[PDB]
Amino acid sequence: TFRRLWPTIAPFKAGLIVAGVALILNAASDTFMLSLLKPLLDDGFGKTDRSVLVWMPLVVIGLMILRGITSYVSSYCISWVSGKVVMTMRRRLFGHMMGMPVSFFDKQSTGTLLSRITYDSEQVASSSSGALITVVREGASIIGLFIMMFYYSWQLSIILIVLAPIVSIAIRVVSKRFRNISKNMQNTMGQVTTSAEQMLKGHKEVLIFGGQEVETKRFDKVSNRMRLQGMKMVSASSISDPIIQLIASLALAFVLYAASFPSVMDSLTAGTITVVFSSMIALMRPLKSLTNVNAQFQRGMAACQTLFTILDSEQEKDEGKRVIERATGDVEFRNVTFTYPGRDVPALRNINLKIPAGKTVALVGRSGSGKSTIASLITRFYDIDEGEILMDGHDLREYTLASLRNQVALVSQNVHLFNDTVANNIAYARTEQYSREQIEEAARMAYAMDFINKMDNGLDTVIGENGVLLSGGQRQRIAIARALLRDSPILILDEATSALDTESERAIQAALDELQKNRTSLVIAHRLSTIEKADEIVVVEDGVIVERGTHNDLLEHRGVYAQLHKMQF
Amino acid sequence: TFRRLWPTIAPFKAGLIVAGVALILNAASDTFMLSLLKPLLDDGFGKTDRSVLVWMPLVVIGLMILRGITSYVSSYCISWVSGKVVMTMRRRLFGHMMGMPVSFFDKQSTGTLLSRITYDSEQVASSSSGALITVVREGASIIGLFIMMFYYSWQLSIILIVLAPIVSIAIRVVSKRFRNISKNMQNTMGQVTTSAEQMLKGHKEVLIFGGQEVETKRFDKVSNRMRLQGMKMVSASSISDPIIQLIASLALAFVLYAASFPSVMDSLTAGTITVVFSSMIALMRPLKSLTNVNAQFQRGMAACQTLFTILDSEQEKDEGKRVIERATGDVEFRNVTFTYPGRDVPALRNINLKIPAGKTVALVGRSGSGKSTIASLITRFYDIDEGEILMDGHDLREYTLASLRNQVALVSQNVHLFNDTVANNIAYARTEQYSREQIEEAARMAYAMDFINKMDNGLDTVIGENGVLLSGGQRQRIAIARALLRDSPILILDEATSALDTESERAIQAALDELQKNRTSLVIAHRLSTIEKADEIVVVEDGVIVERGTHNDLLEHRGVYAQLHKMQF
Missing domain, CATH: 3.40.50.300 (P-loop containing nucleotide triphosphate hydrolases)
Structure with a gap:
């Protein structure tokens, strides 16, 4: 978008290459830990070979001093690059708001001046570096968790990944109908509440005419119609979730049916099944956050054009060159x-x-x-x-x-x-x-x-x-x-x-x-x-x-x- | 519930017993679903029987349907008691607010009186029946999952629950210090940001006195002190998570190490370890939602005092002694x-x-x-x-x-x-x-x-x-x-x-x-x-x-x- 900020970052690209090598090693050490399930369930617990459970407890803590070392080395390299490109802008705004006409400082902005060298100047790098962490951390996790499935079993991975779109579109299609039905019901519920509001407005006329018993008999019919239209809103929203769960589990049943009985499969022995299923659940967290990359790279770039409107503005009109030394006159x-x-x-x-x-x-x-x-x-x-x-x-x-x-x-x-x-x-x-x-x-x-x-x-x-x-x-x-x-x-x-x-x-x-x-x-x-x-x-x-x-x-x-x-x- | 409100619910109490039997069957249909993993991994995929996984596709859709039928029969039979004890009390509020004096309607209340018989009258049942489908659903799922976890390798279960208090208190203790330290650093940041603010106020003096280079070399010296202070509250918050994740894996390593001993390596196998571990992570959401079972039964029984205040206020001062047919006079x-x-x-x-x-x-x-x-x-x-x-x-x-x-x-x-x-x-x-x-x-x-x-x-x-x-x-x-x-x-x-x-x-x-x-x-x-x-x-x-x-x-x-x-x- 506004990549005139890149020349400010160019002098320091040595924490964006060390936080691009120490953050791929943070993600590649999560898709290696999850690969420990296959030995554990094949030659570990299931078999009598105890030798697999004596070297593995070391590499469970030998892989989370490497998820910590590479989660701190990649935070003393973006906090140092997102701190020296905020400093060099913070001190470039406080050389432009120190020479321009006092008309701007008069009442155009009085207390928000600090908010542009304390808050909106740190958000140009606290939301543009949080959109590079997410697009490079959770774009190598997504690749490791895709290489695992196709290494251990491509036969099951293909059928598993083909049904994800079909499950998602089915869930959306069945959710839309029930949402609009619920809206249609809430409209009538609102209408009945409006009728009750018009019922309550005439107390001063209820009292004098003596319709206390005729007005309470006519709330025995607007209240019976508030529960029959209120229990039809829980009888239409409580039938949605069971159906989407059934639709989701029909896919699971199909996967289980197809994963063994055909002779194409049955290259799986208790460890390729769990890693393949347990990694796809690990593919959702590095997919909900990837979509919001451009939702943060644009929220932390409006706050760059704001500062590039404060900066590059008409400075004070230093017109003329004549030099006066002493006002020996009037x-x-x-x-x-x-x-x-x-x-x-x-x-x-x-x-x-x-x-x-x-x-x-x-x-x-x-x-x-x-x-x-x-x-x-x-x-x-x-x-x-x-x-x-x-x-x-x-x-x-x-x-x-x-x-x-x-x-x-x-x-x-x-x-x-x-x-x-x-x-x-x-x-x-x-x-x-x-x-x-x-x-x-x-x-x-x-x-x-x-x-x-x-x-x-x-x-x-x-x-x-x-x-x-x-x-x-x-x-x-x-x-x-x-x-x-x-x-x-x-x-x-x-x-x-x-x-x-x-x-x-x-x-x-x-x-x-x-x-x-x-x-x-x-x-x-x-x-x-x-x-x-x-x-x-x-x-x-x-x-x-x-x-x-x-x-x-x-x-x-x-x-x-x-x-x-x-x-x- | 509240002893005042109970006699309104007591006649219609054969909807919380039908919904108290079709809700334990909703929870017992989830602790029966994390028990197919044992036939699957031991006698199914791993053993390559090819007979356990032609039967299991039918039982995975023979439990989801029963999880849906017991989720609609239990959501209709509470919407019938949460909509009939709100209807029999909505019309007792509109039998007291039709005889009581006019002084109550004029500026002692307004159209918000319909927020007493439409909104605050439904929050007494939408937050007291929402606190009974949490003490019965997620109080029998926790008893179903503790019988799986103990029927399947009780030896490992004791070890796995003894280390939960220890891990939790360790995480809390290591989370306290690194939060208060960051609080101290953010307190320190206020001094530098206030000093930065105190530079933008002397603009009218900065211009006239001629010093614009003397106050820009003193924002080359206050910008660094809010960069080094900005890199010390990110170097203190990025070191908390790596350490708690390390504490959370000195337990997994210990569990896997304890599993190697002869006593705990005669009944664990490929399955009977995936249901003993995966039921724990299914035991957190029930335990998490349980904590909020008295925080909702006092947010939905506080409404049942403001509305009862309306219900038991003072009615009109009908001192009825004399009766007159027609006022033929003055x-x-x-x-x-x-x-x-x-x-x-x-x-x-x-x-x-x-x-x-x-x-x-x-x-x-x-x-x-x-x-x-x-x-x-x-x-x-x-x-x-x-x-x-x-x-x-x-x-x-x-x-x-x-x-x-x-x-x-x-x-x-x-x-x-x-x-x-x-x-x-x-x-x-x-x-x-x-x-x-x-x-x-x-x-x-x-x-x-x-x-x-x-x-x-x-x-x-x-x-x-x-x-x-x-x-x-x-x-x-x-x-x-x-x-x-x-x-x-x-x-x-x-x-x-x-x-x-x-x-x-x-x-x-x-x-x-x-x-x-x-x-x-x-x-x-x-x-x-x-x-x-x-x-x-x-x-x-x-x-x-x-x-x-x-x-x-x-x-x-x-x-x-x-x-x-x-x-x-």
């Missing part, structure tokens, strides 16, 4: 309009925001629709629909993504801490550029030295999740340390309030005020303290920035900033 | 307060109404605040909590229910139509009292003659559900005809249908106006035609009838009735 918006992918209602209308040099602007308002969206466009997590965002006399589309992302610092509340020491989370992906010496200065000027001191090991504690764990204020201060160390010229202070509690508010305010030196920042406003002190106060209300006036003029006005004071107080 | 409510069972909010506060002789009252309120539950109290579907309802200077509680309900007719649109022809559906439960002459005049005066005379058969056509499916305008007409024939003195004109249509509103209004000759009636009002004609207008305002005045006084005042006119326009 990150301006001009007439831009953007709508979230997957929806039609415009979340952002025409907006003209100017972020001046050496100043800060505050996206004021608790609207909840217009504050975070403008923040998201600067870093180009979501690309714009139409218009222009200007940066240093250019456009963000023209600039390289790697050269734009490294200029914006999100000092947010919900910030991620990676599973490393409390120093590389302050210098993530810049450990070579920044030496530890800068890291003490960053922690000191971020006022995080106190929490650094009260630690089990110092500036080396595993700090992310599955580790020490922190509170909100400490994560805020770590993010502030990151931003201060990186010296990013653009900041987006999310500033979720969370708590205004004393001795944490002081620390975060001091760290933030030290951060915002000459840096030009757009602050998402949730705390009035920064709204009071801002160069420009811009209200966002369903994407129409109309109350754009500064703090003083808009405070004098009764506009949305005055109304902000009203709802805050 | 039906008064005085200080009546009633609350619905199963709820605490009083649905009915104090009420003071009097239904005058030769007059009618109209419960005109569209608020839906329990105007219908003032009608239910009259017929005593729901019993009063406190106060006094009077019918002819007495209380309804003293009156016999069969004598109280004989004086009320519910002329509604949702009337039930029983499955009998139209003639008895106009004289339901009183057909012996009323001859065809009275029913003809009742149909004439109800203006219902056209509907029935247009119809195919005439006045004896099957009229109820699953019949001809009359319409609501004909259902209410049939109810009018029924009430006219019964000539009851009090009616409750529900009048739920306020729809106006030519030949329907005119006809139904004419029939109702003919019905209300003297016939002191309380009309639930949805149509203004009766309201403007109403002698006394009373409005439901929650539980208090504040506006207890005539039509004119309520008309001139805004009140609530003229407010209901304002709603109407």
Whole structure:
């Protein structure tokens, strides 16, 4: 089907050839054990020769340390090939779901992302290697159990194998009639139950009219007709099994009649009869599972096209080559309009925001629709629909993504801490550029030295999740340390309030005020303290920035900033 | 069985004795079939007599027929006791759920009541007779197969049963450790999979901070740790089966070795070893099915408590002391307060109404605040909590229910139509009292003659559900005809249908106006035609009838009735 997965398996085909030689020896050692019946019953138990029962108990345990040795050697060769072709796909999906647009991670799939590198990535090899075990184990067992019969007695094997189709079709033909008769009877049984349901519905009219005795006499006739149509469903399903058993045993009677009295037979002496009959019973288990080979090779290959749809998908649009090093200017918006992918209602209308040099602007308002969206466009997590965002006399589309992302610092509340020491989370992906010496200065000027001191090991504690764990204020201060160390010229202070509690508010305010030196920042406003002190106060209300006036003029006005004071107080 | 249920089965106990003799002959016809192997292998094929296998083809189809005749004669004679003790109890549930109060049918149960007399009533016999064809079939097959195994070489049988407990406990002991070890490994897997999950959450930080190569070399180091851990829970689960199969062949080797000694090598031969070994593997399915003989006799005797709960619940509170022929008087409510069972909010506060002789009252309120539950109290579907309802200077509680309900007719649109022809559906439960002459005049005066005379058969056509499916305008007409024939003195004109249509509103209004000759009636009002004609207008305002005045006084005042006119326009 989708055999573009074979090049992933090709580097390791040395556990599919050792599990194709140590699994034929697992099946060829089951059709040799079953051949021990012929000596046992001919020259063993039946005869007075005791010598056959003294070497055989050794080879009964001399053939099941070879069914165990070759059942484990063939499991440290498919668990090693179905583990290195799942690993090399698990780590190829986690290089494609780490660069594509955050639109996919937004809400297209949130918790099923792991299910495609933990569950659907192991099922592409736990159901495609279970369809090679079954087609190569139980395709040499089927050949050994067919060579035994034709070696020991072909005369009886031919007649035995000719009657198997005739028995099977007869059983199916006699089963079909009784199944459809049972269905026809259950239809009438359902009809009578419906009549009883309509009988029970009129209690409120039974009571008032006084038909309690006339209504129970009419359930003496719907109940007598529920047992006569109920005992005709057990008198039609209990007559099926005896007849199919009789049909099956007519074949056995014919085989026994033909196996001795004709002179063509009677080359059999008590051991060729039992092996030939006992192997055909052993031919059914390696025939029920062989049919389901393609029922598993296709169930474990839809989960390959799923991962080849997640893989080979549109990666992030890294358009442009222009390189910017420092935002010595203004990150301006001009007439831009953007709508979230997957929806039609415009979340952002025409907006003209100017972020001046050496100043800060505050996206004021608790609207909840217009504050975070403008923040998201600067870093180009979501690309714009139409218009222009200007940066240093250019456009963000023209600039390289790697050269734009490294200029914006999100000092947010919900910030991620990676599973490393409390120093590389302050210098993530810049450990070579920044030496530890800068890291003490960053922690000191971020006022995080106190929490650094009260630690089990110092500036080396595993700090992310599955580790020490922190509170909100400490994560805020770590993010502030990151931003201060990186010296990013653009900041987006999310500033979720969370708590205004004393001795944490002081620390975060001091760290933030030290951060915002000459840096030009757009602050998402949730705390009035920064709204009071801002160069420009811009209200966002369903994407129409109309109350754009500064703090003083808009405070004098009764506009949305005055109304902000009203709802805050 | 359960001592409550036994006396229902006791009369019909000559179907479990006929089915207890034709079921031991089903099991004794299988332990007679694994005894032809001895004549076959010793005196048949091996000895080449050529006389034992011309007779055996007839006995292999002379036992299967007797295995079928004793499988149908034993499946019909239990379907006759499992379908007659379900029929004699299905109609005892539908003799208790036709007298007990209305409170049981409304929201204390639903159409699932037919899942008590169709499904849960058959599971008391389909799981208690299925637990007697398992203690008798597979409790005489185990006694038949233990007499073969001991008649044929008792010396080998003791050795073969002594090693069954030992092999079983050894397999269990070697299966416990390799299951709990795999549990430990799967517990360890959770740490690595959670760490893998914790990498996909920092996407918004991974992109902006620039590290996509630092987090892909840390999924080159978490993928291996879930490969080596994935190859250690397959190397621990694939080593369990080879060892238990080795324990299961240190017994076969020991059996074959013990067979070599002089004591056990004088009576074993070619046959008398195939029936001593092949009867054991036929002794597992009976022993396996036996374990589930009390797990089915408590799943089919738990139904016999939920249905008995219905069977021995509380019936109606028929305090029948006074008997009245005709209510030639007034039906008064005085200080009546009633609350619905199963709820605490009083649905009915104090009420003071009097239904005058030769007059009618109209419960005109569209608020839906329990105007219908003032009608239910009259017929005593729901019993009063406190106060006094009077019918002819007495209380309804003293009156016999069969004598109280004989004086009320519910002329509604949702009337039930029983499955009998139209003639008895106009004289339901009183057909012996009323001859065809009275029913003809009742149909004439109800203006219902056209509907029935247009119809195919005439006045004896099957009229109820699953019949001809009359319409609501004909259902209410049939109810009018029924009430006219019964000539009851009090009616409750529900009048739920306020729809106006030519030949329907005119006809139904004419029939109702003919019905209300003297016939002191309380009309639930949805149509203004009766309201403007109403002698006394009373409005439901929650539980208090504040506006207890005539039509004119309520008309001139805004009140609530003229407010209901304002709603109407």
